[PDB]
Amino acid sequence: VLFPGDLRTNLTDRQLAEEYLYRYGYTLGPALLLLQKQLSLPETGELDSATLKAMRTPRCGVPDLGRFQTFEGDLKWHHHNITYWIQNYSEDLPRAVIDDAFARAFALWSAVTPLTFTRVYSRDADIVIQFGVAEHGDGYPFDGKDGLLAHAFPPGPGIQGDAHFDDDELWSLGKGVVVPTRFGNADGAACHFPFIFEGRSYSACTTDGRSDGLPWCSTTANYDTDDRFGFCPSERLYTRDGNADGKPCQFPFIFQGQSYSACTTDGRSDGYRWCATTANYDRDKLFGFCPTRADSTVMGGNSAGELCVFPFTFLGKEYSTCTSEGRGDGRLWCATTSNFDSDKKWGFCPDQGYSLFLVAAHEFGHALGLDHSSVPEALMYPMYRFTEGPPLHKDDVNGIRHLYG
Numbered sequence: 001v002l003f004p005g006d007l008r009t010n011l012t013d014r015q016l017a018e019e020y021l022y023r024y025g026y027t028l029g030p031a032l033l034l035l036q037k038q039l040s041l042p043e044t045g046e047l048d049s050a051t052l053k054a055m056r057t058p059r060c061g062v063p064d065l066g067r068f069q070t071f072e073g074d075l076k077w078h079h080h081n082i083t084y085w086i087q088n089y090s091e092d093l094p095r096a097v098i099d100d101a102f103a104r105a106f107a108l109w110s111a112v113t114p115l116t117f118t119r120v121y122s123r124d125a126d127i128v129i130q131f132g133v134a135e136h137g138d139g140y141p142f143d144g145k146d147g148l149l150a151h152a153f154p155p156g157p158g159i160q161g162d163a164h165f166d167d168d169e170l171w172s173l174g175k176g177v178v179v180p181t182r183f184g185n186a187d188g189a190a191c192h193f194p195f196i197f198e199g200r201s202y203s204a205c206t207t208d209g210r211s212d213g214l215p216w217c218s219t220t221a222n223y224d225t226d227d228r229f230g231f232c233p234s235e236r237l238y239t240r241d242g243n244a245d246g247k248p249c250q251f252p253f254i255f256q257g258q259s260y261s262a263c264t265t266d267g268r269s270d271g272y273r274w275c276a277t278t279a280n281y282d283r284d285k286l287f288g289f290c291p292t293r294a295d296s297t298v299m300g301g302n303s304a305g306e307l308c309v310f311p312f313t314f315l316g317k318e319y320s321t322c323t324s325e326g327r328g329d330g331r332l333w334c335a336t337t338s339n340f341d342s343d344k345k346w347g348f349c350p351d352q353g354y355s356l357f358l359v360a361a362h363e364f365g366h367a368l369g370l371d372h373s374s375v376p377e378a379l380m381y382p383m384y385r386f387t388e389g390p391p392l393h394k395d396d397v398n399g400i401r402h403l404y405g
C-alpha cells in the first residue's frame, strides 16, 4: 500500500545531462557526442535512452576530460616501491576484508609492472586511502548515495596519489553485504546472499528454521542442496572484545541495579552497544560488545539505521524475509516493527553494494597515472559494472605498461 518517507526527487533528463556533462569535463550535442565516444555508445549527439541510461549509472568521480586541478609533476611515480596508508575504515565491512581488498587491488598492478606496494601507517605514504562522506577535506565533495563512488589523484606530492571512497555507498565485494560467519560447518566462510532455504529466497540472515533466534545464512546460493552454512553476527551467539571472551549476552542482566533485556550504551559516550554475559554485571563484572548486524539494517525509508523485524505483517499477511511486495520497482524493503499495516515503519534492505575491490583497483589505476579507458569491459572504464572475473583487461595493461617498465 503506501510507504511514507520514500522520497522521489531524482533529477530530470535535462538537469542530469547538464550536470553530468559539466562535472566530467565535457562542457549540448557536441558535448554529448564526446561523451558517447568516451563511453563507446552510439555517437548520435542526442540525449538518447542509451546515453541517459549511462549518465544514470554509478561511476568514478574523476573527470573524463580535464583534471580536478593543476597537478605538480609529470604525473608518473618515479620510485618503484610505493607506500600506502589506510587512514580510515568503512563500517560496512570487516576491517580485514578492507585491508585485503586494497592489497589485492594493488596486486593487480604490481603484477604487470616493476612497482610494488607496501602498507605504511603515516601521512607519509605516497598514497593515502580514505573513506569520506560529503565534504571530506579536499574540495571535491561526494554526492550521497549512488553518484560518483570514489575518486583519486594522479602521482605526485601532497594529496596527489591519494584515493577516496564515498562512504555513502554500501561497500562490499559486490554480491551483497559481506558477512563472515561463526560456527557453522562452513569454516567461517561469508554468507551467500541471496540464498535459498526450504524454497524461499533470503537476502539477509534469518532465524527461521531455528527456535533459538540465532540469525544464520547459507554460504552458497542454495542451502537446500548444499547444507553449508554459518551464523551471522548476533549477541545471542557471541560478543566482541570486553572481558567475557566472546560469550553471548544473557538477557536479562542487571547493571546499575537496572534490568536490561537488550544491549545498551548506558555508561559509555561512544554509543557502543554492550551487554553482560551473566544475569548480573554488578556481581560478576563480565561483559562484551554486541556485534553489529549489517545484513538487515535498513537504508532510507522512515527508519534508516534500524533493523528489519521478522516476521512483520504486510496487508494482513506475514513476511519473514525482505520483500518487494507492495512495490513495482521490485526493490527490497522490510518493516522495522512486527506490524507494518499499523506502524508504517520501514526501510530498504541492503543491496549488492559496490565492490570495494573493483572500485579500488580502478582508483589505484588513477593513483598510478592512468586515465579513463573507453573500452566497456576494461578496468579503467568510468562506469561501475559488477563482474566476477579478473578485472585487468588488455587495454588496462597497455596503458599501465606505457608508463612503467
Ligand SMILES: [Ca+2]
Binding pocket: 125, 126, 127, 128, 157, 158, 159, 160, 161, 162
Ligand atoms: Ca600522498
Ligand SMILES: [Ca+2]
Binding pocket: 142, 143, 144, 145, 146, 147, 148, 149, 166, 168, 169
Ligand atoms: Ca555517491
Ligand SMILES: [Ca+2]
Binding pocket: 090, 092, 166, 167, 168, 169, 170, 171
Ligand atoms: Ca557506507
Ligand SMILES: [Zn+2]
Binding pocket: 060, 061, 062, 362, 363, 366, 372, 380, 381, 382
Ligand atoms: Zn576513474
Ligand SMILES: [Zn+2]
Binding pocket: 136, 138, 140, 151, 164
Ligand atoms: Zn576526495
